[PDB]
């Protein structure tokens, strides 16, 4: 299924920590996010889509068109400027971030009543696992 609608609560958060790092994410700021969960809500209609990632400390908003590229400044993140596209690989949704960064991007999936989140940078991989609200 290609339909990540809905409200999608964190239920497993693997190797967040070595992703930030990988975006040299400050200290303070790194060990303050990954004690963190976080939620998710989604708008999806045909490309268009919409997050919005909420935690209690770092957020994150991302709107996007699948198959238009765009330019994204991760201000809430690393603070660096990528250019971003968004492609379907089957019903994996497939973000490539062109930028500085080696391999940086994230990739998703539902795997039945659960999305699956793998953000990628470097050799590191972060896999997030949440369920539909
Ligand atoms: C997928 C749906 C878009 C959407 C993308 C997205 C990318 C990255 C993140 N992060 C939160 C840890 C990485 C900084 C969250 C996010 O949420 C979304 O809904």
Same mark, same amino acid.
């Given at each position: 299924?290609?339909?990540?609608?809905?409200?999608?609560?964190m239920?497993?958060? $693997?190797? =967040?920590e070595?992703?930030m790092?990988?975006?040299d %994410?400050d200290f303070?700021?790194?060990? %303050?996010?990954?004690?963190?969960? =976080?939620t998710?809500?989604?708008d /999806?209609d045909?490309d268009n889509f919409?997050?919005?990632?909420t935690?209690?400390?770092?957020?994150?908003?991302?709107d =996007?068109?699948?198959?238009?590229? =765009?330019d994204?400044?991760?201000?809430?993140?690393?603070?660096?400027?990528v250019?971003?596209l968004?492609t379907?690989?089957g019903?994996?949704?497939?973000?490539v971030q062109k930028? $500085?960064?080696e391999?940086?991007?994230?990739?998703?999936? %539902? $795997?039945?009543?659960?999305?699956?989140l793998?953000?990628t940078?470097?050799? /590191?991989?972060?896999? /997030?696992?949440?369920?539909?609200?």
């Amino acid at each position: 299924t290609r339909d990540f609608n809905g409200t999608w609560e964190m239920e497993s958060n $693997e190797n =967040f920590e070595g992703y930030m790092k990988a975006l040299d %994410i400050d200290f303070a700021t790194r060990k %303050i996010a990954v004690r963190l969960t =976080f939620t998710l809500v989604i708008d /999806q209609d045909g490309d268009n889509f919409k997050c919005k990632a909420t935690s209690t400390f770092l957020n994150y908003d991302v709107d =996007f068109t699948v198959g238009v590229e =765009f330019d994204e400044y991760t201000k809430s993140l690393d603070n660096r400027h990528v250019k971003a596209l968004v492609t379907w690989e089957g019903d994996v949704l497939v973000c490539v971030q062109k930028g $500085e960064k080696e391999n940086r991007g994230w990739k998703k999936w %539902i $795997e039945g009543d659960k999305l699956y989140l793998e953000l990628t940078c470097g050799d /590191q991989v972060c896999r /997030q696992v949440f369920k539909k609200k």
